Design a protein around this ligand. Structure first.
Ligand SMILES: Nc1ncnc2c1ncn2[C@@H]1O[C@H](COP(=O)(O)OP(=O)(O)OP(=O)(O)O)[C@@H](O)[C@H]1O
Ligand SMILES: Nc1ncnc2c1ncn2[C@@H]1O[C@H](COP(=O)(O)OP(=O)(O)OP(=O)(O)O)[C@@H](O)[C@H]1O
Ligand SMILES: [Mg+2]
Ligand SMILES: [Mg+2]
Lengths: 48, 54, 505, 470, 170, 158, 85, 153
């Protein structure tokens, strides 16, 4: 239970580290989706 | 989840061990101080029997 | 580009000139028509937003004043409008009947009865598009707007004049919250008095009929107005509906009375407004909505308010409804309405199917008006319950573990699981204020800590019948006095619970 | 001959026609002359300068600028009545079964106003299907609106075929099937399936109790945009002109919306989100509001609903939820487990699931089933790390029942025999409630999981467990 | 020609992803307003039309047939994208191949769970049906149990035999 | 309370006044802010010279153009105290996000093709031509406290 | 000027991220077709011209040079975004 | 642009930023790089078999990496620990000092003949160097350089 104490400690920190990198990539894709959906809407409107 | 693999592998396993122990009950039933005795004697026996099909 | 009013037939009358041919000032001729949009030549004097009339008798709103045409959105079936049809000014701006005559009736987006039952009879009429009360003639929100749902009345309290948003994914129960709130008012409906207005926008006819059936069966229709612009109604009607109901509520607000308006939902209203903007060819933005879709909702929700004493002291409380998709509160329309409102009640599917109903997320939901909108009684316990459930939620990871826990953490788990059961509540069963406090008080003072968690719902059911049966006087006083929980009231409560408990066991 | 127009422009399915005198109103049907077969055009807009925009109901290859076009002086009119039964029509009311003309005594326009608000029926009665998950968790309503959501290949068509088998065959009023933008192969399959069930008879077309309408993926967008209307138009006649109960099956109503979006751009609309037409909601509303029970008569509608990329937030399926009385949501995650029908018990609902309508017994069991499943779902993340050993005896007792209940929700479909190699089963409502009640109460914690998988009533679970012993 | 003259033919469209791109080019250069992902509003109908000309004919009509095997190229294993979902929603099944399986040695790299045939055993001879009826299920069970055994825990003879048999079938 | 006290304090320790720009003020909250300032003394309804703050509202129910320009209005009032009376001024902007939203809406309505997450192509210059007026000159200074809303809790949002 | 007269110069572009947004603004108002992150197809070219002028000249051309320190601002360490790449 | 380029190629070498950041050059993704020539009838069965084997173990390692990120290596089966070990040695043995990169690396460039590449990689896959340390395989040419480096340590 000492070994588990320090093992699950490391897992918690590693999870927070993965949560940051995942959030940064999620927000890239979130912004890219809005950017690209808009371009499509606006490109179609300007053809009329 | 994230560990979707471990997730399923675990559920499947502990479901197998559940079903397998029901089979072991059916073994010990097929084998049946003394009531108590046999119920132990053939708990252990039936468990070995199951781990041994041919 | 060519532009409209450069057509062979139209250019004849511009050069030929018949007798008294002009009339381009008060009359026009359809150049083009389709998808609920009519391009019209002439009408030189028609005003932006003016309601004009087609030869079929159909109404239309002038939303676009352009150099050589007017873009009219059609309040009807465009099959009845063709090239060259005569359009006339009525000078009109879109006005609706208002007053108590609307209570107990079902009407369309424009005030017209659709229940087949009641004549008009309305003494007052009102423009649907108007400016909200300004900064000065208002008073801070202080009067409770009881939903009768203990989770809400205790932890996400709404006051008269507030704008609280009901938001969640599809099947989460957000309409139900509005309906139970309307049903709850009957208990008060004479200081309290609250008139209700339910606006249906883009719903099914069957859905609203079931809705009114319930209100009718509960005898809530008597103080309720149902304004309905259903899914087969043309977009412009769905666009106006909310503003028409608003004007019906403003009658009460401005005449020393209190009204509650429900917009179910603004998600569908925005969709209709988008339809008309895109087909008028106004510039598209995020999710293809126009740049003025925020402005659309801000005009609407600001009209809800708590008036000055000098102005009659009346009020209008708003419960706008938004449907999120996959819990994305950062989508465009939701973002707009969340920022406009004074607070939000967020609903969740996970909570719902777990047995937490109403499915309110106590963690995220909020009321910026908060403590100022609840009675002294509730104030005495609500804050503590909010804190104790908050503590429980952060450690709820141990509920599915535990093992080497100590007495303290074990007590937090036991109380939390129980206070959680005490927040569950069935549909069409709003509770009077005195009833809500009595049950919340019980849990907070630990009269339920020994009871089996799974039986709390049954316990509360029996308890409420007992108090309603044997203790209406007690419930009546807690209301009338509206007081805190003093030593006297404490003594009075424990005597009811100790005796009820003994007979229950 | 009628008043004449002349084709000014042809761009795919969109055709502009010019009329020197008399301009046909929006929705009117125009017949284009000088072709191998009659080509119908539907008026969508009046562009000005005596020119109208139209959508074609068939291919436009062969059209020439200046070809004459005749206004029929009304919207598309299609056959209705006894003469349609056992026959197959297309969107424009023509027979496609190689059986000759449908010599009906009346025709009807496929565009119509929706029933008035005072004409709605508020009565709420169950329609039992025999399908355990549906009847238990999100029961269908007689004369109600039912939607079956599913991504590609999760089982919504197999479910609608089963429902026809259990509802329409067992107790026929009259039935209408609309094949809408789906597989022509599936149309042949359904047709032979119905011949076998005798629901369609090729000898007495009078003894047939189902009318068939088809506009599949082989048709151009105009036709796929209106076949739905054609089908519901046939159904309306039975509702109003005969009163008797009517069933309406639609595979797939998504295709109505998709068709519309194919030609929206050429109709000159600014696109909405995800490339859909800005008129999605109103297009859908004026169609869907016609599909309803009224005081005159009943229509029970069951519509398969395609879900693009398995995303229920997609505009088409997302706007469809609001038009329903019962939603049955199918999940790939569940299908992937061998659980059929792949119904998501934590994402299906019914407006009749109310203790005042179905009784507190039905209500509480359904609610209990959903609670133990949401609890398992919340538990799944924990066991995905720690395994099961770390759970308490109670925590794992819910895991075991939850998984049993999930398995007891599966069911051998009669229509699915060609896949399972097993005989279909139909479970009565009372038996469903009882069975599921017992499992939630713990009265079967000693039976193995496999005993619950792919069976009918709870007796079969006990009997399977017995046949599993030896 | 074959289909309608009492014969049977097989067609392969390798591939439709590129045909959609060409349609899109044609259409955009003709000034037709773009739709989703810049494709014409009717890209689905482009492919649905073409498939479905593949059919089994009636005895009365000569009993001939045309079978189609269209190909769609995914990008980064995204079966869920637009053009791919369109075509899946047309065909009578799909054979899904993943780079993960391809590289771990499963070649042809067919993902058995995610591939489907909407015709089923009706497209198999009696013989093939007699052996292959349970192979898909069995392999699915095997993959589950195989992941479970990777926990090193002691395995009874029953599990070990299933693992043994699954590894060999694979 | 922090806003009000910063007002009070800057008046004590610098003789400088304040200006509140409520960009997209909720009328309810505008009424309450007004009475809380009167209650706290930073506003005096009798002696208008004793008042320490000028309020400028662009209510949420006003069109995008007004909500876009209100910050400038309030900024201009504050420039008076820096340039004409050499003071150190306080300029509150609640909320800077709604300033950007208004701009986005105005840009949308003028038919300008939108940028990044649907924001105006002029996002940078709209913000920058305004913020740059807030600074220390030889004569005095405008210091600015700005309530900031972060869309989707994403600090990388434009 | 220094580069071509046998002298050496250093240039700092602080920063090019903002130059690129300014050009994006000009391009969008010109109604040019927006691409990745709404930047015009020629955003790469905007910076290529520029930094290619920083160079080391041989003796035959005076031996002068121009050194460039372009600055780029990333978001949460995203060095795979369009402009940074 | 790139997606449409693949359709014009007979071989594809896909460089990876994640690999380069690990110090492995050339930064070639061994599981995203393909050749229309990798066919047993063209390269021979030995060459063919060794490649599929290398990619097999690398893919297995890849599928684990997700589970290792949180819990770490101690939670793998005594068997997957072994594939991880060989995989990580193989990742490094794919790395190689270039002549043209001397200017930055400071390591003399190396050219390994195809016959020497197959053999070397076969031995590692078969376990003949499970006793050699990882670092021995990083930035060398043929396997003989690996052993020599393992001696320098
Ligand atoms: N507090 C509650 N207790 C019990 N049942 C509830 C409660 N709230 C809602 N329900 C039930 O859940 C179902 C969905 O609720 P409701 O229609 O209010 O939500 P909604 O957001 O309007 O859903 P939709 O938008 O799909 O109509 C209804 O059948 C209703 O009876
Ligand atoms: N109850 C069931 N029993 C056995 N197999 C089933 C069942 N339901 C569905 N399936 C399997 O799922 C596959 C796909 O079914 P189906 O085509 O009905 O799905 P779908 O969502 O309707 O597809 P689409 O909408 O694209 O036609 C079939 O091959 C079928 O074998
Ligand atoms: Mg609702
Ligand atoms: Mg189908």
């Amino acid at each position: 239970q000492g070994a588990r104490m320090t093992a699950m400690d490391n897992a918690t920190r590693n999870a927070g580290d993965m949560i940051d990198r995942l959030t940064t990539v999620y927000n890239r894709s979130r912004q890219a989706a809005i950017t690209k959906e808009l371009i499509e809407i606006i490109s179609g409107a300007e053809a009329l | 989840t994230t560990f979707d693999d471990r997730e399923r592998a675990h559920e499947a396993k502990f479901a197998h061990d559940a079903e397998l122990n029901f089979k072991a009950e059916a073994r010990r039933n097929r084998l049946l101080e003394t009531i108590r005795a046999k119920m132990v004697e053939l708990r252990a026996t039936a468990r070995e029997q199951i781990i041994s099909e041919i | 580009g060519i532009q409209a009013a450069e057509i062979s037939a139209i250019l004849k009358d511009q050069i030929k000139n018949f007798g008294q041919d002009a009339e381009v000032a008060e009359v026009g001729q359809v150049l083009s028509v389709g998808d609920g949009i009519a391009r019209v030549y002439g009408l030189d004097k028609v005003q932006a937003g003016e309601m004009v009339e087609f030869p079929g008798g159909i109404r239309g709103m002038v939303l676009n004043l352009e150099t050589d045409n007017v873009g009219v959105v059609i309040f009807g079936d465009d099959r009845d409008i063709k090239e060259g049809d005569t359009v006339k000014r009525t000078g009109a701006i879109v006005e609706v009947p208002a007053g108590k005559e609307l209570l107990g009736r079902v009407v369309d987006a424009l005030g017209n009865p659709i229940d087949g039952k009641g004549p008009l009879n309305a003494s007052e009429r009102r423009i649907a598009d108007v400016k909200a009360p300004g900064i000065m003639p208002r008073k801070s929100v202080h009067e409770p707007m009881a939903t009768g749902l203990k989770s809400v009345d205790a932890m996400i309290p709404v006051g008269r004049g507030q704008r609280e948003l009901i938001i969640g994914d599809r099947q989460t129960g957000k309409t139900a919250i509005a309906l139970d709130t309307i049903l709850n008012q009957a208990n008060y409906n004479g200081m309290k008095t609250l008139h209700c207005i339910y606006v249906a926008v883009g719903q099914k006819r069957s859905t609203v009929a079931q809705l009114v059936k319930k209100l009718e069966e509960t005898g809530a229709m008597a103080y309720t107005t149902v304004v309905a612009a259903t899914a087969s109604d043309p977009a412009p009607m769905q666009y106006l509906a909310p503003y028409s109901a608003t004007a019906m509520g403003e009658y009460f607000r401005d005449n020393g009375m209190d009204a509650l308006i429900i917009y179910d939902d603004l998600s569908k209203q925005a969709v209709a407004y988008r339809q008309m903007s895109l087909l008028l060819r106004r510039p598209p933005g995020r999710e293809a909505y126009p740049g003025d879709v925020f402005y659309l909702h801000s005009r609407l929700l600001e009209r809800s308010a708590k008036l000055n004493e000098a102005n009659g002291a009346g009020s209008l409380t708003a419960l706008p409804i938004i449907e999120t998709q996959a819990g994305d509160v950062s989508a465009y329309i939701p973002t707009n309405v969340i920022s406009i409102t004074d607070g939000q009640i967020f609903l969740e599917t996970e909570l719902f199917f777990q047995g937490i109903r109403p499915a309110v997320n106590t963690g995220l939901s909020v009321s910026r008006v908060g403590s100022a909108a609840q009675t002294k009684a509730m104030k005495s316990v609500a804050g503590p319950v909010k804190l104790e459930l908050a503590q429980y939620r952060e450690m709820a990871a141990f509920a599915q573990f535990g093992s080497d826990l100590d007495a303290a953490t074990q007590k937090l788990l036991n109380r939390g699981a129980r206070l959680t059961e005490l927040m569950k509540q069935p549909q069409y069963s709003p509770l009077t204020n005195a009833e809500i406090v009595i049950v919340i008080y019980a849990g907070t003072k630990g009269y339920l800590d020994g009871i089996p968690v799974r039986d709390v719902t049954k316990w509360e059911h029996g308890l409420l019948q007992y108090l309603r049966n044997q203790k209406a006087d007690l419930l009546e006083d807690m209301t009338k006095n509206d007081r805190k929980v003093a030593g006297e009231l404490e003594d009075a409560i424990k005597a009811a619970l100790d005796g009820y408990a003994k007979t229950y066991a | 001959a009628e008043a004449n127009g002349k084709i000014t422009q042809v761009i795919g399915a969109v055709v502009d026609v010019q009329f020197d005198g008399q301009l046909p109103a929006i929705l009117n049907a125009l017949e284009t002359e000088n072709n191998g077969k009659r080509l119908v055009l539907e008026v969508a807009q009046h562009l000005g300068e005596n020119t109208v925009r139209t959508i074609a109901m068939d291919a436009t290859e062969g059209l020439v600028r200046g070809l004459p076009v005749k206004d029929t002086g009304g919207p598309i009119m299609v056959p209705v009545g006894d003469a349609t039964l056992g026959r197959i029509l297309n969107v424009v009311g023509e027979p496609v079964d190689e059986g000759g003309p449908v010599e009906a005594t009346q025709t009807r326009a496929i565009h119509q106003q929706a029933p008035d608000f005072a004409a709605q029926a508020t009565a709420s009665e169950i329609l039992v299907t025999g399908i355990k998950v549906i009847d238990l968790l999100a029961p269908y309503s007689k004369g109600g609106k039912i939607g079956l959501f599913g991504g590609a290949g999760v089982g919504k068509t197999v479910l609608i075929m089963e429902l026809i088998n259990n509802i329409a065959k067992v107790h026929s009023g009259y039935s209408v099937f609309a094949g809408v933008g789906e597989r022509t192969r599936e149309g042949n399959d359904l047709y032979h399936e119905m011949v076998e069930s005798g629901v369609i008879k090729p000898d007495d077309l009078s003894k047939s109790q189902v009318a068939l309408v088809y506009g599949q993926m082989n048709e151009p967008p105009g036709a796929r945009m209106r076949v739905a209307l054609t089908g519901l138009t046939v159904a309306e006649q039975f509702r109003d002109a005969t009163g008797t109960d009517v069933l309406f099956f639609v595979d797939n109503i998504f295709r109505f919306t998709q068709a519309g979006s194919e030609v929206s751009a050429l109709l000159g609309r600014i696109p909405s989100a995800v490339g859909y037409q800005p008129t999605l909601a109103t297009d859908m509303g004026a169609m869907q509001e016609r599909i309803t029970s009224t005081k005159n008569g009943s229509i029970t509608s069951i519509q398969a609903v395609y879900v693009p990329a398995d995303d229920l937030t997609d505009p088409a399926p997302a706007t469809t939820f609001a038009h329903l009385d019962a939603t049955t949501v199918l999940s790939r995650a569940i299908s992937e487990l061998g659980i059929y029908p792949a119904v998501d018990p934590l994402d299906s609902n019914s407006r009749i699931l109310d203790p005042a309508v179905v009784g507190e017994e039905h209500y509480q069991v359904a609610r209990d089933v959903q609670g133990i499943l949401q609890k398992y779902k919340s538990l799944q993340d924990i066991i995905a790390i720690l395994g099961m050993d770390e759970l308490s005896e109670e925590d794992k007792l819910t895991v075991a029942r939850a998984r049993k209940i999930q398995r007891f929700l599966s069911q051998p479909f009669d229509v699915a025999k060609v896949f399972t190699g097993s005989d279909g089963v139909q479970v009565p409502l009372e038996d469903t409630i009882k069975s599921f009640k017992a499992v939630v109460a713990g009265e079967y914690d000693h039976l193995p999981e496999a005993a619950f998988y792919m069976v009918g009533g709870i007796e079969d679970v006990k009997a399977k467990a017995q046949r599993l012993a030896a």
